[PDB]
Amino acid sequence: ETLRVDPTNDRLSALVEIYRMMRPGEPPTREAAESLFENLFFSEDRYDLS
Amino acid sequence: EEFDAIKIALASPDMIRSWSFGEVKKPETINYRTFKPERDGLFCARIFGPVKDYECLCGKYKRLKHRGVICEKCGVEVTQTKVRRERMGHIELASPTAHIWFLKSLPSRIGLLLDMPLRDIERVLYFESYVVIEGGMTNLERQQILTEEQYLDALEEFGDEFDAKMGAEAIQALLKSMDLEQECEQLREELNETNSETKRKKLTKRIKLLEAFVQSGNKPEWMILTVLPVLPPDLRPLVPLDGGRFATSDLNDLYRRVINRNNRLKRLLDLAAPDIIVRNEKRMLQEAVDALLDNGRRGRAITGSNKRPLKSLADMIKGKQGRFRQNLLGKRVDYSGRSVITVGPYLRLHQCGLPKKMALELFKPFIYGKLELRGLATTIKAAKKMVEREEAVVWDILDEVIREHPVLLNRAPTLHRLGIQAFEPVLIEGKAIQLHPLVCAAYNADFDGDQMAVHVPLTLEAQLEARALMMSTNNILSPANGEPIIVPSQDVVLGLYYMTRDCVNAKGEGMVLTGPKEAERLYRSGLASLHARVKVRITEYEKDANGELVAKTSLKDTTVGRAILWMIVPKGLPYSIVNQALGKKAISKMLNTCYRILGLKPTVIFADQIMYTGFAYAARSGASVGIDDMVIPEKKHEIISEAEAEVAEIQEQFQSGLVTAGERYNKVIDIWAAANDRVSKAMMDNLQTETVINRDGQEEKQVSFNSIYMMADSGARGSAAQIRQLAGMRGLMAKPDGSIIETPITANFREGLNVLQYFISTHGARKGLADTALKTANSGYLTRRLVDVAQDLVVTEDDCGTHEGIMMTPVIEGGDVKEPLRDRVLGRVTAEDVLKPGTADILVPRNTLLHEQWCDLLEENSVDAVKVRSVVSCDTDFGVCAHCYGRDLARGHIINKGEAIGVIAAQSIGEPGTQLSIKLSNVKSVVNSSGKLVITSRNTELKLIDEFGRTKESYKVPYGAVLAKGDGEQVAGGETVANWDPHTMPVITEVSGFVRFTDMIDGQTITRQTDELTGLSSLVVLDSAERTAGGKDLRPALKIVDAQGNDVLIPGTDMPAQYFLPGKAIVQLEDGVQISSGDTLARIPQGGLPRVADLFEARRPKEPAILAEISGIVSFGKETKGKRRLVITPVDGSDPYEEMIPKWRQLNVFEGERVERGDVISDGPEAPHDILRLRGVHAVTRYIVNEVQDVYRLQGVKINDKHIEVIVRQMLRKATIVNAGSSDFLEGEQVEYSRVKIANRELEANGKVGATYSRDLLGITKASLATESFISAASFQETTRVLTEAAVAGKRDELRGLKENVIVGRLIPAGTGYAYHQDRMRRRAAG
Amino acid sequence: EIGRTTDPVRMYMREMGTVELLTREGEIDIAKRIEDGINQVQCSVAEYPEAITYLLEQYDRVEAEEARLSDLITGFELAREKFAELRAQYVVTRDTIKAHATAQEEILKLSEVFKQFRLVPKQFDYLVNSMRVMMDRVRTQERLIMKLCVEQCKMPKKNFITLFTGNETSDTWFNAAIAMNKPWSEKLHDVSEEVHRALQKLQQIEEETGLTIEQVKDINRRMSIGEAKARRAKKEMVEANLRLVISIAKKYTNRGLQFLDLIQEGNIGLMKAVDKFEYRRGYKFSTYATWWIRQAITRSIADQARTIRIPVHMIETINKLNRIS
RNA sequence: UGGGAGAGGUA
Ligand SMILES: [Mg+2]
Ligand SMILES: [Zn+2]
Ligand SMILES: [Zn+2]
């Protein structure tokens, strides 16, 4: 049901929508969306439980 | 200085330039070498006046000889320095920006005026998208929000015809180019063709807004700020610190931001900057102006240097620490002290012990005046130093000054009005305010470290308020209920209980005494105790018909202690006042009886003397607590062991697998509750009657002299629950999840708890301590909301001459009498007579204050219900009359005109919030074949009237319930007369004969199945949501006919005997059988403080009860849909009304009967809005009063019903108009009900049709905001919304409220100021 | 897109994201276009005779020894003799203007010898705005002529742009407008006296300029297109280095001022660096722009950051005494 | 002296 509601197509469209949620009003692009989704969770300096 | 009105409106740029004195053009405030203010700065002397009194900046003009001149050297006008907080400046903004209040406070007023969405207006203001103002072509219309690409297309396409601008200047040009009367006329035509609900509401909102602009005379261009004004620099001051560094206000920072960005915009417009840079600077100026007007409103709040958001102008005025609620209502006050309070029992009732040093500091200018009058000091400096050196002549002058000069003892939180009282002070040596012990029940103050404020009245009028209105010997009775609050509390009560109790053979029993003086002589000589049952001679004085006192003298069988108190009890009271053991309720009745018989002065001296003797004999008693005085019952371990064995027996039965876990849980709780009740009963027995070792008749028994039982039975400190926790069992303690724990705390506070029981007890202790804090906050918020509704209510007239009223029946719900007629009606004024024969034929006329003698006559003749005038039904404009309110409860007589009712009513309601024969009526029945009578109505009540005529109980029977007793039958007690089916709802009949099974076929409306127990088939009517296509247009009917088949009619009506049964009916009766009359046919199945706050805020509940809006029969009209519509047609006229009922909700009223106005169609809680609109004003008043009093009686607090009626009358102030006559009300405008009453009075005076209306119960928050006074509404709550609505509509304040005259600074029209205000009103009328 | 954004610096970064960065070579071409506009505005203000008499009389004012030698000349005993022979060339072209291509070649030779005088920019603005205000005088004059011929007679506009826009010096066009037998031309007699006032006003323009309306219209038209080209080239140079402004102001953030104020004052410094940039020193744009952007940001945070404002010379003096002692 | 935050405590 979540896949039927979900309007994205693939990975780059998913990153653009995550960019539009996190930093709204900014024109998204591929490299900025990739760097944003990497450095939110999967970076050793901006995420830590450890 | 003597103004009649405070008119608020919008500010034109010409008016802002008329306020100002010079354009502020520099951000820098002052210098750093020498600290003189700059030129055209934020603190400048030429704009905001001079810094020193009568001096320029350079030092040329330096005296008052040059009174007012302008200095030609530096521009500083030589005046006083008081004009540094009266002169404003102005900033000349380059781009005109938008006001954030009239853009973001919803509804936005710019979206509501221009008819543009707020998102699109925000896109225009954020310079993101162009908007077009005017266009000659048909391609681009007015208000078509173009993007950048569309504008660049249109620029190369047309380029000459259209003009599209972007930003706040475009919105200013749009509001300029629009036409108010043209748009108002076009929308008035647009409202008339069709009326959808959302479109008509939006159109009438816009029409009300546009008509507000035209009638106020404002212009829509004034919402766009072109010229921004500047606060004076002593209202945004520059205060230093102790280390040279400065600590300015946040307003100087915000003004510096606005001035810097405006100067940069001027520089960028002169430098021919690029479009991106100048657009960003215009956006920055808009952001800075919006931040200065309201920081936290538009976007991210601009934070200061210490990471905190700055305080703007809207944050200075609005909030908990705003200007209104921190300085305008409650101010700091000179001539004031504060100290700890101790006990002085040597005082009188109107005295308090001020210390010497603290009162010398208080009364210092009075000592200055007496020193200069007596010639002991020539000058004020000599008098100052003589007081500061503390001489003996200064102490003598202070002793002379403080004599007969009352001071007010305030203690915060002042919940009710007895938290401020005036006392004649007596100078003591110490540092603590010695109160009287009696007034600490009014102050709610114990001496565990409390603190009280001492304020000193200065003027002669203020001393007379404190002497005649606020003296502590005047307010004995509480204003909540008419009972004395100057009452003995716990220590006088213990002493008087130990006095007037009697032993059996104590010392010197059975003598004869010459009177009270010889009894006191016997006790203080030591030949007889306080408990000797002795015969004394008592000379009591009864009251004559007039004020004379006749006497009688006889022998009474008394004690020595009661014969000691007869020296104290004044002349006028009987001996049955004294001749019982005096608990706290008994001494309360003594002081009440002494008040109503003698007056005030014998009551004051009786309270002082009874306190003296209570303290003296409690000291001579020696009533001590010990460890041998908390007597544990000797059968505690046996009951505990039996209960544990029974709990273990049910536990092993559950472990065997017979009884379920929830039933085991409920059984264990019920067993431990029964065990706790048995242990508590055995404990109470063994503590009450343990004293059995007696003599001089035999081994006799009496009540025990144990001190724990003594301080429990006296009502002094504690109750039977506290004694149970000390001696018996602790009981069942609850978890914080609400569920009661299975095993209870068996040990008490004498045997000592173990570790796990104490850890279980900490749950409830911390929960109760947490709950207490929450309720006090809630109660204070509720008290503030109640006061701010009931501010504007005062007594104006002596009598209104109305004939309405509320018939006060004693509340008789359940099996007992909740309130008697005496507590319900004592104090009010009878509207009509009392027409009953009775025994003595009491006939009180109208306009009679019901005294205690008249209420005694009503009790003797046993009147059921009397109609008295209430505050809600009063017909006086802007205030009530004295005869509808009745008795001033604090005094005991009729209420003086001019005294504010509503503040007393709101305080009395919100103060205990920190403590929170067979008679048949309305019937329609038929006698069956067996005499077991059935009722065919739902609203039938079973009244239980005694043989004297009064009512004992009350019960409501269901529809179709069986009944054995008829009218007039007197059944004995204990007989079960209520017999009814709880789960099934019958569909019973009233005729007899055969049944014709018409309009039901197996397959589309009924389900063919059988019962699993008897094998007989049963025809369950299938619900319409699961029927097939053949059952979407039929209703099955039990067509009852006669014995051969003709259509029998109902006797009385013309309707055929049909029964449209609903679904899920267990039809056991088949065709071809005989049916009697009245038999069944089928079976159809089915806190305290938040409740008070939800009743007074008038909330529609989660499941409202559907009611009938028009009287008549009810039928169904719409098919093939589960939303059951009711075509409730009248029995006389046509039906203009239908009603929509959801799927799952059941119905009580079937489609064959006739309902009255306001019948319960769907069961559940009924909402007070429709209660008013259908039943009536008196019905919704009675509903609110009864459901509030149910809460306040559950918790045990006495509150008179007139206070709740005052809040209801203040809630019902609005009245929308459904049809107009010739008055100036067009359609649906919520005007005040007093205004339409005055308009209808004028219209029926000069002979016209008049205008009808319909009232509406607003909540507390909505009524105090929709109060016509913007100052009262903004001081209560939502200052931004109230000031925005008032500024747009152009309102004015007429200065008629108590809160308004507190804010402005005049005498309130409440009490003493009422004469001055009515003199001022008649001066304004006669001229 | 344009969503629910509320930070203005985020919208600034969106509105600056539309432009592209500059390459290694392109800003030399933009600076060449800027210098071409400056050369065009100088070569169109060169041949104006009253401006030449203004510079000679300001040279008489500096040679009468009451004004300094810095507020009217920047560079190129030498300027004195070359202005003396310019004055000799001026007093011979005052009477060889009567004779006809000799007049055109002598005024263009005065125009090209004028190009050596490196004048001060404030008096350049004086020359440009003096041309602008005499153009405003004659423009409201012709707007008055345009207004009076549309208000009364409802005539088409092709005859007006062929008759009025010819010589418009003598009365040869007004009598031609009356003498074309049209029913409004016989009722243009009440307009006649204030248009004769307008004609003598045009004759006043002929004696204070010396040339006709058509030559000065062409001169200020060349002035307008050169000013528009130079301003558009300057504008394109400005909106391609805003990322440099945010790169400089990224470090001055928590100094008592908001982040958006810093990049705004950096944009002011960027404009001041664009207006005074010289491309012939080989440097691209950034080594010259960084100093001006840093100066504007530092002078912003040294003044508008505190209530008690300390001047910049006093705070470096107390800082120098704090670092030595 | 006056202003604003943060923490603690008393009724
Ligand atoms: Mg206390
Ligand atoms: Zn001066
Ligand atoms: Zn009344």
From Swiss-Prot, chain A:
Record note on modification: Acetylated on several lysine residues in the presence of glucose.
Practical applications: Co-administration of salinamide and rifampicin or salinamide and myxopyronin suppresses the emergence of resistance to both antibiotics.
Subunit structure: The RNAP catalytic core consists of 2 alpha, 1 beta, 1 beta' and 1 omega subunit. When a sigma factor is associated with the core the holoenzyme is formed, which can initiate transcription. The rRNA transcription and antitermination complex (rrnTAC) consists of RNAP, NusA, NusB, NusE (rpsJ), NusG, SubB, ribosomal protein S4, DNA and precursor rRNA; S4 is more flexible than other subunits. In pull-down experiments interacts with CedA. (Microbial infection) Interacts (via flap domain) with Escherichia phage lambda antitermination protein Q; this interaction renders bacterial RNAP resistant to transcription pausing and allows it to read through termination signals.
Its biological purpose: DNA-dependent RNA polymerase (RNAP) catalyzes the transcription of DNA into RNA using the four ribonucleoside triphosphates as substrates. Resistance to the antibiotics salinamide A, salinamide B, rifampicin, streptolydigin, CBR703, myxopyronin, and lipiarmycin can result from mutations in this protein.
Similarity remark: Belongs to the RNA polymerase beta chain family.
Protein name: DNA-directed RNA polymerase subunit beta
Residue numbers of the full-length protein present here: 349 to 398 of 1342
Curated annotation (Swiss-Prot), chain B:
InterPro entries in alphabetical order: DNA-dir_RpoC_beta_prime, DNA-dir_RpoC_beta_prime_bact, RNA_pol_asu, RNA_pol_N, RNA_pol_Rpb1_1, RNA_pol_Rpb1_3, RNA_pol_Rpb1_3_sf, RNA_pol_Rpb1_4
Required cofactor(s): Mg(2+); Zn(2+)
Any single Pfam family the record assigns to this protein: RNA_pol_Rpb1_5
Keywords on record: Acetylation, Antibiotic resistance, DNA-directed RNA polymerase, Magnesium, Metal-binding, Nucleotidyltransferase, Transcription, Transferase, Zinc
Residues recorded as bearing N6-acetyllysine in the entry: K943
Signal peptide range: none
Chain residues that bind Zn(2+) 1: C56, C58, C71, C74
Applied biotechnology: Co-administration of salinamide and rifampicin or salinamide and myxopyronin suppresses the emergence of resistance to both antibiotics.
Binding, Zn(2+) 2: C800, C874, C881, C884
Superkingdom, natural source: Bacteria
EC number(s) given by UniProt: 2.7.7.6
Biological processes annotated in GO: bacterial-type flagellum assembly; bacterial-type flagellum-dependent cell motility; cell motility; cellular response to cell envelope stress; DNA-templated transcription initiation; intracellular iron ion homeostasis; nitrate assimilation; regulation of DNA-templated transcription elongation
Cofactor comment text: Binds 1 Mg(2+) ion per subunit. Binds 2 Zn(2+) ions per subunit.
Alphabetical list of SUPFAM superfamilies matching this protein: beta and beta-prime subunits of DNA dependent RNA-polymerase (SSF64484)
Family per record: Belongs to the RNA polymerase beta' chain family.
HAMAP family named in the record: RNApol_bact_RpoC
Subunit structure: The RNAP catalytic core consists of 2 alpha, 1 beta, 1 beta' and 1 omega subunit. When a sigma factor is associated with the core the holoenzyme is formed, which can initiate transcription. The rRNA transcription and antitermination complex (rrnTAC) consists of RNAP, NusA, NusB, NusE (rpsJ), NusG, SubB, ribosomal protein S4, DNA and precursor rRNA; S4 is more flexible than other subunits.
Full protein name: DNA-directed RNA polymerase subunit beta'
Originating organism: Escherichia coli (strain K12)
UniProtKB/Swiss-Prot annotation, chain C:
First-listed, main subcellular location of the protein, grouped into a coarse class: cytoplasm
Domain of life: Bacteria
Leader peptide range in chain numbering: none
One of the protein's GO biological processes: regulation of DNA-templated transcription initiation
Keyword flag DNA-binding: yes
Intervals of motif Interaction with polymerase core subunit RpoC: 261-264
Compartments, as annotated in UniProt: Cytoplasm
Molecular-function GO term, any one: sigma factor activity
GO cellular component terms, A-Z: cytosol; cytosolic DNA-directed RNA polymerase complex; sigma factor antagonist complex
Region (Sigma-70 factor domain-2), start-end ranges: 237-307
Free-text comment on this protein's domains from its UniProt entry: Contains 4 domains, connected by flexible linkers. In the active conformation, the domains are in an extended conformation, each making extensive interactions with the RNA polymerase catalytic core.
Subunit (UniProt): Interacts transiently with the RNA polymerase catalytic core formed by RpoA, RpoB, RpoC and RpoZ (2 alpha, 1 beta, 1 beta' and 1 omega subunit) to form the RNA polymerase holoenzyme that can initiate transcription. Identified in a complex containing RpoD, the RNA polymerase subunits RpoA, RpoB and RpoZ, CRP and DNA. Interacts with Rsd; this prevents interaction with the RNA polymerase catalytic core and with promoter DNA, and as a consequence, promotes transcription from promoters that require alternative sigma factors. (Microbial infection) Interacts with Escherichia phage lambda antitermination protein Q.
Function: Sigma factors are initiation factors that promote the attachment of RNA polymerase to specific initiation sites and are then released. This sigma factor is the primary sigma factor during exponential growth. Preferentially transcribes genes associated with fast growth, such as ribosomal operons, other protein-synthesis related genes, rRNA- and tRNA-encoding genes and prfB.
Family: Belongs to the sigma-70 factor family. RpoD/SigA subfamily.
Stated name of the protein: RNA polymerase sigma factor RpoD
